[PDB]
Amino acid sequence: QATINIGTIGHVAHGKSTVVKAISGVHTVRFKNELERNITIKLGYANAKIYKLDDPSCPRPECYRSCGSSTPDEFPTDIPGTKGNFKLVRHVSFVDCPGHDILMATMLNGAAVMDAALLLIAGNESCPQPQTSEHLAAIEIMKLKHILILQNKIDLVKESQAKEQYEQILAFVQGTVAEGAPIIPISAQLKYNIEVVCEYIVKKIPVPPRDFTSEPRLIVIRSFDVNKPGCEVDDLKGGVAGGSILKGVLKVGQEIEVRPGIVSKDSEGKLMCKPIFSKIVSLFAEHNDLQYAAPGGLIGVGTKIDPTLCRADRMVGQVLGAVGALPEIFTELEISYFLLRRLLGVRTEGDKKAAKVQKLSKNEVLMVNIGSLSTGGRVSAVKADLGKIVLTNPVCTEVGEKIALSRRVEKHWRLIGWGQIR
Amino acid sequence: CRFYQHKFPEVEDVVMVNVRSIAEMGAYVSLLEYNNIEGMILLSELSRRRIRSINKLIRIGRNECVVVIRVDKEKGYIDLSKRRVSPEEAIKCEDKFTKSKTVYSILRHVAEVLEYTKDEQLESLFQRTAWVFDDKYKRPGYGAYDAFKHAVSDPSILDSLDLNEDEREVLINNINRRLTPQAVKIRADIEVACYGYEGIDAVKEALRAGLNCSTETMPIKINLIAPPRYVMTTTTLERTEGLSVLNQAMAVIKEKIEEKRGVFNV
RNA sequence: AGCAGAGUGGCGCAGCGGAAGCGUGCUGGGCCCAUAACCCAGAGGUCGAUGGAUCGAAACCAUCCUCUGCUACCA
Numbered sequence: 001q002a003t004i005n006i007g008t009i010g011h012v013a014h015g016k017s018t019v020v021k022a023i024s025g026v027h028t029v030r031f032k033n034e035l036e037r038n039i040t041i042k043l044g045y046a047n048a049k050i051y052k053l054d055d056p057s058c059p060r061p062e063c064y065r066s067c068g069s070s071t072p073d074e075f076p077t078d079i080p081g082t083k084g085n086f087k088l089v090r091h092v093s094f095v096d097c098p099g100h101d102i103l104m105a106t107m108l109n110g111a112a113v114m115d116a117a118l119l120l121i122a123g124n125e126s127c128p129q130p131q132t133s134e135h136l137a138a139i140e141i142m143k144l145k146h147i148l149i150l151q152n153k154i155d156l157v158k159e160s161q162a163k164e165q166y167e168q169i170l171a172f173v174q175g176t177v178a179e180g181a182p183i184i185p186i187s188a189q190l191k192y193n194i195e196v197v198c199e200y201i202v203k204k205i206p207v208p209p210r211d212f213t214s215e216p217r218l219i220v221i222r223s224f225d226v227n228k229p230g231c232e233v234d235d236l237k238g239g240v241a242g243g244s245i246l247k248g249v250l251k252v253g254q255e256i257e258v259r260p261g262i263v264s265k266d267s268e269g270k271l272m273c274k275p276i277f278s279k280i281v282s283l284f285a286e287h288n289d290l291q292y293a294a295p296g297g298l299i300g301v302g303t304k305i306d307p308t309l310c311r312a313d314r315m316v317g318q319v320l321g322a323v324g325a326l327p328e329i330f331t332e333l334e335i336s337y338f339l340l341r342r343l344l345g346v347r348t349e350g351d352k353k354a355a356k357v358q359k360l361s362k363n364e365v366l367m368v369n370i371g372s373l374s375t376g377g378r379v380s381a382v383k384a385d386l387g388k389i390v391l392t393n394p395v396c397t398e399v400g401e402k403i404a405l406s407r408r409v410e411k412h413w414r415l416i417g418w419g420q421i422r
Numbered sequence: 423c424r425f426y427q428h429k430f431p432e433v434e435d436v437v438m439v440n441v442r443s444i445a446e447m448g449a450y451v452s453l454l455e456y457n458n459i460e461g462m463i464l465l466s467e468l469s470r471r472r473i474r475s476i477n478k479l480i481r482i483g484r485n486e487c488v489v490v491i492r493v494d495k496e497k498g499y500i501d502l503s504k505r506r507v508s509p510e511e512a513i514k515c516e517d518k519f520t521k522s523k524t525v526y527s528i529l530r531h532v533a534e535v536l537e538y539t540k541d542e543q544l545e546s547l548f549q550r551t552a553w554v555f556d557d558k559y560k561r562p563g564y565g566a567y568d569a570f571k572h573a574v575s576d577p578s579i580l581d582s583l584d585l586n587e588d589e590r591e592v593l594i595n596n597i598n599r600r601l602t603p604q605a606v607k608i609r610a611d612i613e614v615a616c617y618g619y620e621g622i623d624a625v626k627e628a629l630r631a632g633l634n635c636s637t638e639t640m641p642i643k644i645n646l647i648a649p650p651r652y653v654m655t656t657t658t659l660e661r662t663e664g665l666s667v668l669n670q671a672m673a674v675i676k677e678k679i680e681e682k683r684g685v686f687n688v
Numbered sequence: 689a690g691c692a693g694a695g696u697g698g699c700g701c702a703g704c705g706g707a708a709g710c711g712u713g714c715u716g717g718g719c720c721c722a723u724a725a726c727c728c729a730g731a732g733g734u735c736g737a738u739g740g741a742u743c744g745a746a747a748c749c750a751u752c753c754u755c756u757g758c759u760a761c762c763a
Contacts, residue, residue: 033763225763228689232626234646235621235622238621303619304622305619306621308615475727476727520705595741599741599748
């Protein structure tokens with residue numbers, strides 16, 4: 001299954017497929033294939049098995065040696081050991097977030113259900129690069145600090161440039177946790193020092209305490225392509241949710257409720273929403289059958305919903321509770337909030353632009369990323385430490401946790417501040 | 423031999439010819455819309471406009487539609503004209519030309535076995551069989567092909583008048599080989615947008631009831647093209663008997679799914 | 689994968705139940721003192737496979753495969 005969710009976030013032009021296939025062995029893929037204008041801009045999924053030969057390096061199935069195929073310029077070979085079967089240490093899960101700035105709201109959502117991260121830095125561009133800081137700050141807000149910085153694209157980048165970049169990032173982030181996070185330079189054109197990464201992810205990132213006894217909550221981020229094959233139609237025996245569970249052991253045959261709900265017919269107001277109920281058909285993770293779905297892992301829960309809800313990616317950031325979950329489904333919400341004194345996620349080579357953003361004004365639409373949900377809503381009252389927001393689609397608030405608040409600076413929204421629900 | 427019910431053409435009738443020579447004064451041509459009798463076309467009555475080329479108009483080895491302007495009944499001079507021709511007449515004549523060819527090929531199997539050492543053999547077969555098939559249904563626009571097509575799908579037509587031997591197998595084979603496979607363009611149009619989870623089994627009960635009052639063992643063609651769209655090609659007759667199968671079946675699927683939760687497309 | 693088209697005999701488009709169909713091009717001839725325009729003349733040949741009726745099948749009708757067009761998903 002899975003034990004931890006390590007995320008693979010990282011700004012434009014570092015190469016995703018080479019690094020993702022080295023760590024998991026499962027390609028990051030999605031709609032439009034095709035391939036990728038550059039690096040994956042979709043929310044990729046992948047799981048993997050991490051075993052040892054009693055060595056800090058992680059074998060392949062063929063554990064005698066491993067000859068790469070990253071480049072035919074030279075032969076990159078590494079040796080994990082010699083063969084006689086290897087001991088399974090754990091089953092790991094990844095969360096490949098978008099690597100592009102416009103997709104920030106999606107990157108936030110996907111990130112918010114991980115248990116650790118890997119900041120994929122690229123040495124090609126600017127030293128205190130916008131997105132590195134954006135990522136790091138969001139991570140410390142959500143409730144994580146289990147980060148391993150990875151210098152992923154320094155294959156042709158000289159050692160002065162690459163040294164200056166790690167220095168400037170680590171010096172800018174002087175107020176964000178990063179001093180207890182290692183910085184592992186690797187090759188992505190010769191897959192070198194990959195074996196030492198395997199030592200790091202088992203060290204810096206154990207399994208955090210998971211609450212089995214507590215009531216099941218599944219947070220779905222990705223829909224399912226079911227169905228439409230054959231034989232026997234139409235619509236499906238139904239619809240599969242790619243979600244991570246962050247609380248409770250969800251057992252097979254259990255009934256689960258999707259709690260933001262669907263709005264009642266001919267509503268004259270903003271109420272009333274009614275949750276949808278679906279019975280769990282199957283609990284699939286990796287490529288191995290399971291009867292349980294332990295928390296701390298990203299699992300494909302097939303449920304008895306019908307094709308229309310899964311025919312496109314429409315279940316991004318929905319909260320699912322088993323069953324008749326107590327969590328309130330607000331339509332208008334009381335945010336406590338604070339703002340950054342800089343505009344995060346933007347800063348280029350020349351002061352233009354990135355400074356203090358002006359105070360929020362009422363009746364402006366802002367993206368409130370609450371939980372893994374992403375709703376848009378307008379601010380109806382605006383006091384400094386008390387704003388009232390009215391949301392277009394209702395938000396199930398599992399706990400008052402955190403929020404991330406963004407404002408439409410130009411073409412798309414950009415992160416301005418965070419806070420906590422009251 | 424003759425391809426037509428009458429031996430000689432009338433006056434103002436649309437016919438077909440095949441050019442075998444090009445004359446100074448027009449075109450002398452053989453018929454293949456009747457006997458191989460001679461008919462003369464004249465240069466003046468071919469068009470109402472100039473004529474630069476001449477082999478990019480009429481040339482040898484071409485079927486050309488034309489109107490019989492005059493006929494000498496006793497002499498056998500079939501005067502001809504291409505001046506009054508419309509494309510609608512060409513469609514009507516090409517069909518009659520093609521249909522006579524296939525019908526005479528059916529009435530050639532008869533002559534393969536019987537005494538045909540003399541050319542008049544086919545003429546003997548043609549007059550006695552063809553006329554009673556087509557004359558009864560010429561006034562409604564049918565050829566002898568209609569009579570034979572009716573016989574294969576209900577055999578009483580060719581048993582109502584003298585039935586030949588060995589003919590019947592080849593007759594059946596050629597009717598059933600060429601005029602089929604044989605066909606239903608019945609497709610169901612069904613739209614559904616469920617909030618149900620019991621929809622998967624609900625649809626199964628609805629699918630198997632596409633035709634009411636049939637056995638549970640009836641074979642049908644289910645098709646899934648998209649998630650809301652359920653196409654059922656219903657029991658394949660001719661699409662004039664499965665009309666009730668198409669129309670009322672659509673009501674079943676849309677009704678069965680509304681009972682288990684929510685509103686749907688009607 | 690649902691629907692559509694095709695699987696050269698110079699080119700390009702692919703026409704129909706009679707073995708190149710249309711448009712074009714190339715090459716040659718004719719007209720003219722000459723050119724254009726105009727008029728004629730060409731060319732080794734199941735046209736992806738497996739079958740049936742047939743005198744015969746790119747073309748009459750099927751069973752298969754492949755490439756593409758529109759729609760669009762299993763992967």
